[PDB]
Amino acid sequence: VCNTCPEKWINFQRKCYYFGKGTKQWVHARYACDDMEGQLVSIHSPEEQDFLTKHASHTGSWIGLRNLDLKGEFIWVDGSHVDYSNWAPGEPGEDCVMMRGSGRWNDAFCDRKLGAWVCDRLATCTPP
């Protein structure tokens, strides 16, 4: 049972999620998550995506995905690779990834300031 989250974070499966507000460019959102002991959200299943679409800002959010090599090798901030994807039609507009209100993903310029950003961290577990 991995379901304990810090105050203000929401649990989904074995992860904790923070739905941040305030205008930030991608790297600023990256540090906002880091300084809260989390990281910009990494998405690995349709169930996780569905949960995020339900809770995320209608005006768009930064997520933890980037074209790290600038040639299409999209990597999550925690170093994990893209298995599950939720790209909008014609995606992958530049090097950082944002999630629209629909939950669908699109490339964006890293220096664009978005009003929303999502953090995740692992839920802590109650010992059996």
Angstrom distance (rounded) from CA 113 to CA 61 = 10
In terms of phi and psi (left: phi > 0; alpha: psi -120 to 50; beta: otherwise), the region of 110 is alpha
User: Can you read off the two tokens belonging to residue 121?
Assistant: 């961290």
| Experimental technique used to determine this entry | X-ray
Detail the residues annotated as belonging to a binding site.
91, 106-107
- Show Cβ contacts of residue 104 under 8 Å, excluding neighbours closer than 6 positions: 86, 87, 88, 91
Structure resolution, Å:
1.9
Let me know if 36 is exposed, middle or buried by CB neighbors in 10 A (0-12, 13-18, 19+). Answer: middle
Detail the residues annotated as belonging to a binding site for Ca(2+).
91, 106-107
Q: Decide if domain 9-123 falls under CATH 3.10.100.10.
A: yes
